Amino acid sequence: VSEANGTETIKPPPYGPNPSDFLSRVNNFSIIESTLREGEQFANAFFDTEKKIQIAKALDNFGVDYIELTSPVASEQSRQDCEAICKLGLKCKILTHIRCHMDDARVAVETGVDGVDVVIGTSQYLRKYSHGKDMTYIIDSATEVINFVKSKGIEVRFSSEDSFRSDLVDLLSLYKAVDKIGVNRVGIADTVGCATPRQVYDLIRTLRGVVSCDIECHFHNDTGMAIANAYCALEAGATHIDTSILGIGERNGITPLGALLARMYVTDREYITHKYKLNQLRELENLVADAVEVQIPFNNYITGMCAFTHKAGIHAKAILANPSTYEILKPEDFGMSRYVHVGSRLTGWNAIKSRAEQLNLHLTDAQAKELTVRIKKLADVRTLAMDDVDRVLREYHA
Amino acid sequence: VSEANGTETIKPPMPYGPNPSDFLSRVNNFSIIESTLREGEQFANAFFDTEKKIQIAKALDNFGVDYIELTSPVASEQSRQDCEAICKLGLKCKILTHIRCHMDDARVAVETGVDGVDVVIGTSQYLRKYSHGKDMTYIIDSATEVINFVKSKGIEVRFSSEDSFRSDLVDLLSLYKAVDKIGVNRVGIADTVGCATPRQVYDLIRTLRGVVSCDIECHFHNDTGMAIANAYCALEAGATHIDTSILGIGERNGITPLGALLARMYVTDREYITHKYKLNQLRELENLVADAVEVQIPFNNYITGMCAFTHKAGIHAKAILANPSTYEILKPEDFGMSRYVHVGSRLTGWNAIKSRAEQLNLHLTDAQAKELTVRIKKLADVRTLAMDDVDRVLREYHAD
Numbered sequence: 001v002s003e004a005n006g007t008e009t010i011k012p013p014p015y016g017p018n019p020s021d022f023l024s025r026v027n028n029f030s031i032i033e034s035t036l037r038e039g040e041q042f043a044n045a046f047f048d049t050e051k052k053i054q055i056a057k058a059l060d061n062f063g064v065d066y067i068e069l070t071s072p073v074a075s076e077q078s079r080q081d082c083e084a085i086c087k088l089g090l091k092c093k094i095l096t097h098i099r100c101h102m103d104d105a106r107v108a109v110e111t112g113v114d115g116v117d118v119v120i121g122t123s124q125y126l127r128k129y130s131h132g133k134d135m136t137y138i139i140d141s142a143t144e145v146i147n148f149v150k151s152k153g154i155e156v157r158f159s160s161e162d163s164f165r166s167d168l169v170d171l172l173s174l175y176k177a178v179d180k181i182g183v184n185r186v187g188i189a190d191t192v193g194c195a196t197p198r199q200v201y202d203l204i205r206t207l208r209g210v211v212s213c214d215i216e217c218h219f220h221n222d223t224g225m226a227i228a229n230a231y232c233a234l235e236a237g238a239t240h241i242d243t244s245i246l247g248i249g250e251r252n253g254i255t256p257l258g259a260l261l262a263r264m265y266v267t268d269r270e271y272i273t274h275k276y277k278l279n280q281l282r283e284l285e286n287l288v289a290d291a292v293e294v295q296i297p298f299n300n301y302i303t304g305m306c307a308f309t310h311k312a313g314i315h316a317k318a319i320l321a322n323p324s325t326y327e328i329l330k331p332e333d334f335g336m337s338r339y340v341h342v343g344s345r346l347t348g349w350n351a352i353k354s355r356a357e358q359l360n361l362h363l364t365d366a367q368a369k370e371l372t373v374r375i376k377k378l379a380d381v382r383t384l385a386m387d388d389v390d391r392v393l394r395e396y397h398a
Numbered sequence: 399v400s401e402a403n404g405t406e407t408i409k410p411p412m413p414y415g416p417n418p419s420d421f422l423s424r425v426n427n428f429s430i431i432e433s434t435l436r437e438g439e440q441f442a443n444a445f446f447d448t449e450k451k452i453q454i455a456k457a458l459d460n461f462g463v464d465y466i467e468l469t470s471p472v473a474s475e476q477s478r479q480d481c482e483a484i485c486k487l488g489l490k491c492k493i494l495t496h497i498r499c500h501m502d503d504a505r506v507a508v509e510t511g512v513d514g515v516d517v518v519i520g521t522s523q524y525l526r527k528y529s530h531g532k533d534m535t536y537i538i539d540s541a542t543e544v545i546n547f548v549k550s551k552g553i554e555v556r557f558s559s560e561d562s563f564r565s566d567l568v569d570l571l572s573l574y575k576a577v578d579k580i581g582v583n584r585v586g587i588a589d590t591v592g593c594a595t596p597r598q599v600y601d602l603i604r605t606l607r608g609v610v611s612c613d614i615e616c617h618f619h620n621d622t623g624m625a626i627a628n629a630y631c632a633l634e635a636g637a638t639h640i641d642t643s644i645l646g647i648g649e650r651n652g653i654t655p656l657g658a659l660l661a662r663m664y665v666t667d668r669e670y671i672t673h674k675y676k677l678n679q680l681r682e683l684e685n686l687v688a689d690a691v692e693v694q695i696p697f698n699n700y701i702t703g704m705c706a707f708t709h710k711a712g713i714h715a716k717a718i719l720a721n722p723s724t725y726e727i728l729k730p731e732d733f734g735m736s737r738y739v740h741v742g743s744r745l746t747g748w749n750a751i752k753s754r755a756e757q758l759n760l761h762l763t764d765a766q767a768k769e770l771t772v773r774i775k776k777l778a779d780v781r782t783l784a785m786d787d788v789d790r791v792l793r794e795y796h797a798d
């Protein structure tokens with residue numbers, strides 16, 4: 001039934017793609033996985049060679065196109081680890097992260113890397129007036145590094161620290177200069193964690209117009225924008241995004257690998273599910289979690305205890321449609337069996353059983369008991385946490 | 399030294415100031431509707447009793463939020479009673495309850511004493527039809543009277559539609575326009591499913607801002623990592639109110655987290671956020687919820703997670719070119735902490751406690767230090783420590 005408090009319907013004035021969409025890289029981009037560089041800055045990371053090798057092997061199998069390693073001049077161990085990893089015959093390309101110096105580059109090339117991701121310092125380029133023109137130059141010695149690396153057949157990308165806090169006149173002029181010389185890629189880094197998504201879109205879109213090469217983005221997560229900035233970077237034409245497993249890095253870290261893949265999955269399911277072995281993500285996160293001794297957060301994307309939960313009960317009635325209507329991520333696409341519908345809270349073995357069934361761990365009668373004994377001995381110490389269920393199950397595989 | 403591989407410096411053309419769209423921005427002038435006691439009740443492990451809801455409400459009030467939202471008093475008798483109980487505490491902030499669009503639900507809401515009702519309208523409660531040759535959208539009679547009843551009783555009203563980013567725009571914008579014509583305090587946008595992207599949020603809210611004249615509320619799920627970014631872009635586009643939840647707790651992986659939102663807004667305008675909210679209360683506020691829903695604070699939680707204020711010292715700090723102290727967008731003192739912790743080697747046992755306790759401004763007695771060192775041993779005895787074990791054993795400790 002109706003009365004005269006309605007309004008004329010707002011209709012728009014044929015539809016197709018906007019010119020912008022053509023530049024978008026949302027279903028066609030590369031991850032540069034940086035667990036073995038930026039991740040080494042994580043407060044509790046102390047990877048030894050064996051552990052670096054396992055992480056590299058597992059990243060390669062997972063499907064990433066590049067892995068980035070700590071500068072081989074950081075330390076002798078670092079140099080050796082870089083050599084070792086370059087000899088495993090991975091399919092993905094191997095990059096190393098270096099300052100813009102000749103010695104750093106020689107050593108990088110010696111170790112066998114496929115490319116050097118270079119950071120240029122603000123002293124390695126100046127503006128000057130020359131024959132009545134405002135001119136930006138990359139200084140002689142710094143230009144030499146690019147040419148050397150190119151001559152030895154190796155990929156080069158050049159970036160600047162703290163890109164969102166630099167003067168745009170300097171920053172864009174530098175990237176145009178580097179582009180005239182010729183690199184594979186330039187990089188943008190929100191080192192400080194202050195960039196906002198529209199700010200990112202606007203900058204990358206402009207960079208895309210200034211240079212002709214590829215564009216890499218590196219986003220810190222101090223203020224919760226790292227996944228959102230990666231996404232807007234992609235919409236604007238960025239071709240490569242730096243990630244880290246569980247985002248581990250300096251302070252609270254960077255764009256988390258799993259989080260990014262969750263976002264990109266929703267945008268294009270076939271693309272992501274075929275490129276990456278998604279069912280391997282738990283096992284990939286657990287490996288790092290174990291090494292850096294952290295627990296997987298209860299609300300971790302995809303793989304946290306609660307990511308695939310629906311509330312059953314009086315509180316489900318707050319949403320109007322069936323709660324199963326709202327399932328943007330399909331658990332099977334990530335190796336899981338279902339959304340778990342939670343009414344009562346499950347203590348003890350009931351909690352293990354549920355989560356284990358969800359994770360596709362076909363457990364023994366014998367394993368059920370070992371686990372139950374271990375959770376009792378844990379609760380004897382203090383109250384359990386949702387987090388503990390994933391922790392006791394860490395050593396178990398689908 | 400230089401050689402002719404430079405270029406024309408790119409310079410913008412010749413005075414700079416604010417763009418018109420900036421004037422619509424609410425980034426330093428917006429309200430939080432805190433929904434720990436509504437959306438948070440959908441958290442997989444939430445079972446708040448009355449005593450606990452009262453404590454969370456008192457602590458939210460003190461903290462500085464303008465609104466707290468409660469579960470429908472019609473969901474159950476206990477809900478009804480808890481809603482009455484919270485409305486009688488004399489909180490400064492306003493108390494809203496979340497309800498379906500029905501007269502019975504609205505009557506009871508008003509009776510309990512709420513300051514406002516946050517209503518969700520269903521798909522069957524509005525039509526499109528042709529009336530005298532014009533394409534017309536109507537709120538149905540039975541739904542419209544809910545609005546008027548509540549208004550007649552002096553209570554605030556907001557109307558939302560569920561799953562806004564997956565509706566037809568023709569339907570959705572026409573509904574909000576109809577609702578605005580009838581007159582409400584607020585309309586709400588909800589990304590129930592967790593699929594909205596920030597530029598898409600910006601575009602929709604700026605448009606909604608052009609369509610209606612009332613306030614605009616936003617609710618964002620975090621399935622894909624966009625909840626804080628969407629809140630931010632919503633604010634830039636004119637949204638006036640944002641739904642949050644302590645630690646984000648809600649359905650699935652939850653919604654815009656209170657602390658995370660405050661970290662984002664703090665960077666945008668330090669003075670505004672530090673004066674409005676008691677930021678040094680945040681740890682206590684999260685721990686109270688963490689205890690109730692039996693979770694650990696993630697190691698990488700914004701502001702308050704173990705590693706949020708850590709710089710790596712050593713060979714790996716040389717990866718960034720400036721000194722690590724240059725990159726401290728959040729000041730630890732603004733949040734009740736003492737400093738960034740510079741980590742070289744891994745601390746263990748008492749050492750780890752000492753470090754984090756000092757960072758947190760816990761002035762620990764000798765007796766407490768030993769209690770903690772004992773409990774930490776008893777923990778390591780069961781399995782290897784995680785870095786979140788440090789915060790967990792420290793949870794029942796407070797700053798002076």
Ligand SMILES: O=C(O)CCC(=O)C(=O)O
Binds near residue numbers: 117119161187189
């Ligand atoms: O080299 C880069 O592009 C990134 C360096 C980095 O980690 C940062 O700026 O936070």
Ligand SMILES: O=C(O)CCC(=O)C(=O)O
Binds near residue numbers: 496516561590617
């Ligand atoms: O009432 C609203 O606006 C939000 C309801 C909700 O939690 C949701 O859509 O996820």
Ligand code: NA
Binds near residue numbers: 209210211212
């Ligand atoms: Na171009």
Ligand code: NA
Binds near residue numbers: 607610
């Ligand atoms: Na308007």
Ligand SMILES: [Zn+2]
Binds near residue numbers: 191218249250254
């Ligand atoms: Zn970084």
Ligand SMILES: [Zn+2]
Binds near residue numbers: 437617619
């Ligand atoms: Zn919700």
